Amino acid sequence: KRVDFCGKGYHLMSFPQSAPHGVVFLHVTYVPAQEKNFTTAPAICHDGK
Amino acid sequence: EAEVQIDRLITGRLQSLQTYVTQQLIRAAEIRASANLAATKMSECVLGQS
Numbered sequence: 553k554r555v556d557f558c559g560k561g562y563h564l565m566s567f568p569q570s571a572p573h574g575v576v577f578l579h580v581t582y583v584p585a586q587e588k589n590f591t592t593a594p595a596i597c598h599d600g601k
Numbered sequence: 602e603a604e605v606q607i608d609r610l611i612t613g614r615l616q617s618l619q620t621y622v623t624q625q626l627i628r629a630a631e632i633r634a635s636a637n638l639a640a641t642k643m644s645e646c647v648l649g650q651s
């Protein structure tokens with residue numbers, strides 16, 4: 553859950569691979585896109601509640 | 602005897618330079634560790650919530 557520890561975005565999973573003298577991690581990340589703009593409101597009161 | 606005198610001077614100054622370089626290396630390693638910790642703090646406690 554720690555941000556930007558492994559990957560760039562929201563972390564899903566990782567796969568390890570060997571190297572001559574090291575390790576290589578393949579991180580899978582989820583990134584939003586195609587945004588839209590809307591009008592918000594904190595709370596809605598009906599019948600005085 | 603001038604070769605002997607300059608040899609003594611050279612070896613003394615070389616010893617001093619070696620000591621200075623070693624001290625600088627140790628200080629650089631410590632600073633690098635501290636800055637890595639600071640970078641982790643910047644990445645975690647600012648761009649999100651801990």
Ligand SMILES: *[C@@H]1O[C@H](CO)[C@@H](O)[C@H](O)[C@H]1NC(C)=O
Nearest residue numbers: 585586587588589590591592
């Ligand atoms: C939504 O409308 C605002 C108002 O001009 C605009 O600034 C914003 O860019 C719009 N959203 C997107 C995704 O373009």
